Amino acid sequence: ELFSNIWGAGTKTAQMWYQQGFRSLEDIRSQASLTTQQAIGLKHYSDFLERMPREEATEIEQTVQKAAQAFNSGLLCVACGSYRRGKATCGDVDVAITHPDGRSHRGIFSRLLDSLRQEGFLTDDLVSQEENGQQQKYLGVCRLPGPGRRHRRLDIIVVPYSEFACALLYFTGSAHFNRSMRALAKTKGMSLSEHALSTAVVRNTHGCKVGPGRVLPTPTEKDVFRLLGLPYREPAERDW
């Protein structure tokens, strides 16, 4: 069951396709109906089975940073995921982008992606543009210049500065760790997302609601941990 490995396909679709006679990667490319992601996953099947050394992730991060700072030299670009958690290898790269003035993040997302296309860095686009609140998310594939380079999954997320701490936390992960933090937030009547940490409603000692839900200010990751009642954990401690 090698269908599993194709990107955009899990055990979920591995269990159909087979329903059909398909038992081959080739069988799927030629006869099966495919998602835009699945087509790309098939196109780079061999490459997407290989993790990259973290040095390559650094090169990917700097490539995105260089192209973004040409447009505004104050833009903050950070690679998250397993990279930020300090692993020796990474399966993909998520680059979060913001600006400290907090408003110069707009107008970058479109121009940046285009700039990376022209120089041949971005090779395949899963989703060219996703708009989630004030966050803009690119999902695609990249490849560093030169010979012997494999194709690497790359996400780029541009975020407002007021959401940066929560975004960094969310894209740094791990997925387990996020689930754990969301559960902790809930025990305090809060909710945690990639945008913000907020409370549900405000109630007094009589149980009467006296206000709407509150968006808790979180300038840094440490604020999130403080608000959840936890000692701060470095990214390297967040694998589980």
CATH of the domain at 217: 3.30.210.10
Dist CA 186 CA 163 (whole Å): 19
Same domain, 91 and 155: yes
**122: its two tokens:** 């971005």
Looking at the structure, do residues 134 and 192 belong to the same domain, yes or no? no
Q: What is the CATH number of the domain that holds 42?
A: 1.10.150.20
- 187 within 8 A of 228, measured Cβ to Cβ: no
Tally the domains of the chain.
Answer: 3
My answer on whether 80 and 138 are in the same domain is yes
Q: Provide the token pair at 91.
A: 């399966």
**Known binder of ligand: residue 82?**
yes
The dihedrals phi and psi of 64, each to the nearest 5 degrees, come to -65, -35
For residues 28 and 39, give the distance between their C-alpha atoms in angstroms, rounded to a whole number: 9
Residue closest to 203 by CA, chosen among 192, 214, 195, 194: 214
134 and 79 together in one domain: yes
Domain that holds residue 63: 51-173
Q: Nearest-CA neighbor of 60 among 84, 36, 42, 25? A: 84
133 and 85 co-located in one domain: yes
How far, CA to CA in Å, does 211 sit from each of 44, 198, 222?
Answer: 52, 13, 26
201 is in an annotated binding site: no
Same domain, 161 and 62: yes
Host H or E run for residue 145:
none
Backbone angles phi, psi at 57, to 5 degrees: -60, -40
Method used to obtain the model: X-ray
Question: Does residue 29 have a known ligand-binding role?
Answer: no
Q: How far is CA 55 from the centre of its chain?
A: 19
On whether the CB atoms of residues 223 and 181 are closer than 8 A, the answer is no
Distances (CA, A) of 200 to 193, 212, 221: 13, 8, 20
Nearest-5° angle of CA 157, CA 7, CA 78? 25
- Together in a domain, 205 and 99: no
CATH of the domain at 149: 3.30.460.10
Using CA atoms, how far apart are residues 161 and 104, in angstroms rounded to an integer? 9
Q: Is 223 annotated as a binding residue?
A: no
Residues in the chain, total: 240
Please check if 91 is assigned to a binding site.
yes
Residues 6 and 97 in one domain: no
Separation of alpha carbons 24 and 198, rounded Å: 48
Experimental resolution (Å): 2.4
27 is in an annotated binding site: no
Query: Does residue 167 share a domain with residue 56?
Result: yes
- Is 131 strand, coil or helix? strand
101 is in an annotated binding site: no
Same domain for 137 and 159: yes
In angstroms, the CA 233 to CA 224 distance is 11
132 is in an annotated binding site: no
Same domain, 60 and 75: yes
Q: Could you count the other beta carbons within 10 Å of the beta carbon of residue 218? A: 22
